[PDB]
């Protein structure tokens, strides 16, 4: 059991000073500063509490270097709205338009 | 099961704050932390987030209600008054 130290000037256990223990080829356990965990997008509806599916959960500026296929799905509102609410958006748009023809 | 005789939920306060005050918060803490039946989805999941904020965990409906209850008696009385005051306008 060897006691390891920080590898940077920051000496406080802040949200940016987060590390993980990594074993090196020199058989040493050193600190490896981890990236903060990313979050997959939420549905633009504001109802479904779960996150979207088919999208990487990375940091915002990491999305710049990812390809477009990894940031959405092949649906209409895919990548911004969940599949459940898109079906509701289509049926609500259709049925309301039908009620506006009945009044005519 | 019957572990306390009178205090119930206010047993967390022990011997503090007085009997009549612990009895007064008891009626409120029960209704404050109560799971109410949702009038939108039918499930009994209307729990309180903050003052006047009541949210359901299934239909995701947030309702502006009372501080310690889902609806105060002053709101159902006004809602019944505004309802009949609207009926006297159309006629």
């Amino acid at each position: 059991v060897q006691r390891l130290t920080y590898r940077r000037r920051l000496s406080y256990n802040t949200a940016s000073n987060k590390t993980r223990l990594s074993r090196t080829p020199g058989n040493r356990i050193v600190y490896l500063y981890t990236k903060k965990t990313g979050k997959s997008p939420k549905s633009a509806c504001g109802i479904c509490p779960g996150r979207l599916r088919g999208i990487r959960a990375v940091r915002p500026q990491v999305l710049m270097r990812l390809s477009k296929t990894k940031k959405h799905v092949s649906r209409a509102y895919g990548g911004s709205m969940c599949a459940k609410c898109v079906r509701d958006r289509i049926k609500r748009a259709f049925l309301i338009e039908e009620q506006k023809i009945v009044v005519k | 099961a019957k572990r306390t005789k009178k205090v119930g939920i206010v047993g967390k306060y022990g011997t503090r704050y007085g009997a009549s005050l612990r009895k007064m918060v008891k009626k409120i803490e029960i209704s404050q932390h109560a799971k109410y039946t949702c009038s939108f989805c039918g499930k009994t999941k209307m729990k309180r987030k903050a003052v006047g904020i009541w949210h359901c965990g299934s239909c995701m409906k947030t309702v502006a209600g009372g501080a310690w209850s889902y609806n105060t008696t002053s709101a159902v009385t006004v809602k019944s008054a505004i309802k009949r005051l609207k009926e006297l306008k159309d006629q």
Binding site: - | I28, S74, V78, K86
Partner: protein, 245 residues
């Protein structure tokens, strides 16, 4: 003597409001053509908690009639409204809880909230939790309406003052007796630095006109005149009467 505690609150150094986590100024949608000759349809998006007040706020989403945009309004949440319902604001709005319409277009005895004191100020009266205002009478000749404020005062306002139908949500908040001094600490930690109030009799004569003496008596009549100078105007300011009543 020195400047008393009551005077130091006007300089606003440590007595300013704690407005870091507040969500904004709760006010009605500003009066436009859609609210003078009709109504505008607004959807309630979320009912949020405003730090510092016991009344929730509704994030009602409207549609701008002059540009393609969605206006987000922060209204006082009337008790009964919910996310997903449509709030209609304007002159031709129907008398439903949550709608905003002038007092002149509402029958006598209508319970309203977030009432405008003057036409256009976007709501000044009956804004705290559980409070409301009642429409007493009208006067189409002078276009003035008489309303009853939650303090029992009857104010004559214009008939164009807009208000939300219903009572402010969060009612009965003062009915729960605070038990710990810590709950009062957190109550005012979000509002301002005013909770721990030292009694003037518990001070020295230098910092309060009630302090001093080998006992903690007031020594002087606590009822003080209204024209008393700042630093002396403590106790019961211009008290018409005293006692248990």
């Amino acid at each position: 003597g020195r400047v008393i505690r009551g005077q130091r609150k006007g300089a606003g150094s440590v007595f300013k409001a704690h407005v870091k986590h507040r969500k904004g100024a709760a006010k009605l949608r500003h009066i436009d053509f859609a609210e003078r000759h009709g109504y505008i349809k607004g959807i309630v998006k979320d009912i949020i908690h405003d730090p510092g007040r016991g009344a929730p706020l509704a994030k009602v989403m409207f549609r701008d009639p002059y540009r393609f945009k969605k206006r987000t309004e922060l209204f006082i949440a009337a008790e009964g409204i919910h996310t997903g319902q449509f709030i209609y604001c304007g002159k031709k709005a129907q008398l439903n809880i949550g709608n905003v319409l002038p007092v002149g277009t509402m029958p006598e005895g209508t319970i309203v909230c977030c009432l405008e004191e003057k036409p256009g100020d976007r709501g000044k009266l009956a804004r705290a939790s559980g409070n409301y205002a009642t429409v007493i009478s009208h006067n189409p000749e002078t276009k003035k309406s008489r309303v009853k404020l939650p303090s029992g005062s009857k104010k004559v306002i214009s008939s164009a003052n807009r208000a939300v139908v219903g009572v402010v949500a969060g009612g009965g908040r003062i009915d729960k007796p605070i038990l710990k001094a810590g709950r009062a600490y957190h109550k005012y930690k979000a509002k301002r630095n005013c909770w721990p109030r030292v009694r003037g009799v518990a001070m020295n004569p230098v910092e309060h006109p009630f302090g001093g003496g080998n006992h903690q008596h007031i020594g002087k009549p606590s009822t003080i005149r209204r024209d008393a100078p700042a630093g002396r105007k403590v106790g019961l300011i211009a008290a018409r009467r005293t006692g248990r009543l």
